[PDB]
Design a protein around this ligand. Structure first.
Ligand code: HEM
Length: 293
């Protein structure tokens, strides 16, 4: 009925092979630090990992990270994906260097690398994604809109099998990077340390004095006097009672948040994939720092 996407390890590669891809990405993150006014490419990679995974549909098993379909024009030119071409271009040279890795594996590894190199938690990762044909490319319109409420969010996430806790954990990724008017019709960062992974998102949500205003693209956003912004969907996390109690917990305990994020992120990246019993267990990569590089 539903497609079956069985993970198949890149022939003859082991842990050491993947750690090398990881190190290459990480070294290039360290090196191209001027991107986006010195934010670096971390945030854009994280966003890319979400976008390639978020097209999944638990009803017929289409979309998700397995097929590396973002590589095709249709998905590539998805209006919801505007701005991601920057993460793509960042990874190309890496792919050229390690041509045996599948796309889905590369896109998803980039997210993991980014998180860990920005001092986030360790995210166990699995290889085995296999490139699929251009016709397995999902139609545009499966990614979420920003101008909605908590109801919308819950519903949307349900399509990916995520519960409340998972939604809130994943959203703390909004501590990174910022919105760009030309990309999404929104402008401004969510906080101050936008290239270090922390629970800042939750603190800003609870602690700032947010004002609803229209931006230059004529969209509504929540603006704070500190110069931060929140999308309607971010703001909805404090409008929903179930969401709000989790926001508070995270605001209160970065460690808890890191644990929840880690699990949720890996789940997101593995949705739609079947891992045979002989498949290697998830790898945990060392950072540059841990290797002394
Ligand atoms: C309701 C769900 C979500 C909505 C509506 C949403 C919407 C957006 C929008 C409109 C942008 C700005 C794009 C631009 O102008 O460059 C953005 C950026 C971003 N998104 Fe989300 N997002 C959602 C969930 C997530 C999740 C689950 C993650 C990862 C766990 C994520 C990671 C990011 C990151 C890191 C950025 C900043 C990228 C940069 O600085 O280039 N988002 N998101």
């Amino acid at each position: 009925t539903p497609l079956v996407h069985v993970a198949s390890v890149e022939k003859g590669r082991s842990y050491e092979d993947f750690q090398k891809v990881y190190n290459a990405i990480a070294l290039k993150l360290r090196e191209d630090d001027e991107y986006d006014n010195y934010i670096g490419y971390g945030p854009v990679l994280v966003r890319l990992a979400f976008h390639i995974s978020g097209t999944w549909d638990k009803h017929d098993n289409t979309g998700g990270s397995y097929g590396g379909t973002y590589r095709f024009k249709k998905e590539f030119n998805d209006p919801s994906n505007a701005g991601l071409q920057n993460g793509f271009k960042f990874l190309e040279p890496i792919h050229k260097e390690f041509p045996w890795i599948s796309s889905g594996d590369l896109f998803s590894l980039g997210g993991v690398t980014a998180v860990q190199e920005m001092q986030g938690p360790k995210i166990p990762w699995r290889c085995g994604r296999v490139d699929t044909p251009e016709d397995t490319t999902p139609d545009n319109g499966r990614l979420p809109d920003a101008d909605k409420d908590a109801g919308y969010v819950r519903t949307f996430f349900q399509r990916l099998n995520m519960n409340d806790r998972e939604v809130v954990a994943l959203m703390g990724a909004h501590a990174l990077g910022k919105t760009h008017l030309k990309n999404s019709g929104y402008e401004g960062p969510w906080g101050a340390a936008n290239n270090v992974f922390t629970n800042e998102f939750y603190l800003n949500l609870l602690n700032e004095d947010w004002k609803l205003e229209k931006n230059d693209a004529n969209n509504e956003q929540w603006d704070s006097k500190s110069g931060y912004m929140m999308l309607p969907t971010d703001y909805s996390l404090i409008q929903d009672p179930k969401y709000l109690s989790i926001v508070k917990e995270y605001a209160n305990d970065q460690d808890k948040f890191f644990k929840d994020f880690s699990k949720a992120f890996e789940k997101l990246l593995e949705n739609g994939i079947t891992f045979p019993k002989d498949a290697p267990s998830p790898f945990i990569f060392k950072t540059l720092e841990e290797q002394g590089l």
